[PDB]
Ligand binder design. Sequence first.
Ligand SMILES: CCc1cc2c(=O)[nH]cnc2s1
Ligand SMILES: [Cl-]
Ligand SMILES: [Cl-]
Ligand SMILES: [Cl-]
Ligand SMILES: [Cl-]
Ligand SMILES: [Cl-]
Ligand SMILES: [Mg+2]
Length: 348
Amino acid sequence: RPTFYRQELNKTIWEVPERYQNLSPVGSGAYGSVCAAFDTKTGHRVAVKKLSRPFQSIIHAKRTYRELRLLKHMKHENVIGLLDVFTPARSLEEFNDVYLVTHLMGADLNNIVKCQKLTDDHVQFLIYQILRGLKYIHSADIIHRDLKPSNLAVNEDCELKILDFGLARHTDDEMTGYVATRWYRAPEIMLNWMHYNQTVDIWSVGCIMAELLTGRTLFPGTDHIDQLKLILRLVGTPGAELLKKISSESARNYIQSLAQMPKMNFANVFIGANPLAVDLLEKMLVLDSDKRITAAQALAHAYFAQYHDPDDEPVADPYDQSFESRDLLIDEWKSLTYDEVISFVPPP
Ligand SMILES: CCc1cc2c(=O)[nH]cnc2s1
Ligand SMILES: [Cl-]
Ligand SMILES: [Cl-]
Ligand SMILES: [Cl-]
Ligand SMILES: [Cl-]
Ligand SMILES: [Cl-]
Ligand SMILES: [Mg+2]
C-alpha cells in the first residue's frame, strides 16, 4: 500500500498517494471534482477525479460500479483508458471514497471545429479514428449513447480518443430546448420510441462528420419537435417499409400527422464536399436504423482508403454485463466496487 497525504482544495479533502504531485482544480460536475496532477511514477500529466456521494443510493452505488467496470475494460488507442484507481480505506468496513486517474486531455473537437480550418484529409483522419474506436466498443456489446464533439479529445497531431461513455445519467431538463446535449441523438431514442441499440451511435458519427465538413451544427433544434422536423426534411418521412417496424403507437400517431417529404439530394446540401464523403453520410444518416452502415463496414468505405488497415483495427475482449439485470442492496454494490478497486492492474 502506498503512503497517502491530505490537502483541502476548494472546500474538498483530497487524500492521494505520494506519487501524485502539484494537484490543481480543473472543474466539477455533479458526478465529482477533478484535479490536474503530475504522476511521478509514469511521468504523465493526469486527471484525478474524486467521485461525489458514490454509495448514497442503490441507483448511485450501481452507477459507481458500472463506471469502474467500463473504464477497467477499455484498452484501445482511440478510447480513454484507466491509468489508476485508489481508495485511502484500509478495509471494506472503512471504505467510502473512490478516485479515478486518466491521461489529462487538453482540447476537445469543439475547440478545433469552431476555431480552426479542417481540410478533407483532417476530416478523413478524425472520422477514421472515431470509427476504429467504435468498432472496438461495439465488439464488446457496449453502446456509448452520448457521442458529441465535447466527448472527443484531440491533440496537436490530430490524434483522437473517445471519452465520457453514457452511464444513463442525463436528465429531462438537460435534454430540454436549444442544447448540444440533444443535437447528436438518433431520432428513435430522442422521444424514447425505441430501446437503445449500437446503431444509435452511427447516427451521432454522421452528425459530427457533417459539422466538420460545413463548420455548422447539422440539426440545431430549438426543442425535440423542431429537431425531428429538421431531421425529416433532410432524410424524408418514414416510408411503407419503415412504418411497418414503428411499434411505438405514440410515434405512428404524431409521425402520420406530418405532410410526407422526400429525402433531399445530399450533393446539393454538402456543396463542394468530396463525393466519397457525401456517399458515406447518406449511408450513416438513414432514418431506418437497421439499414445504417456499421462501424466495421464503414472502415472499409473508399473515403478511408489512405488510413484503412484491416490488420490494425482490433476488437475487444468479451465484456460480461449480467450485473445490469441484477437486484442488489447498497452494501452489496459497494463490496463489488471495493473488489474491483483492489484487483486493478496498471497498464504496462
Ligand atoms: C422516426 C424515427 C424512428 C426510427 C425507427 C426504426 O428504425 N425502427 C422503429 N421505430 C423507429 S422510430
Ligand atoms: Cl506513492
Ligand atoms: Cl488513454
Ligand atoms: Cl475511503
Ligand atoms: Cl458537444
Ligand atoms: Cl467481463
Ligand atoms: Mg463530456
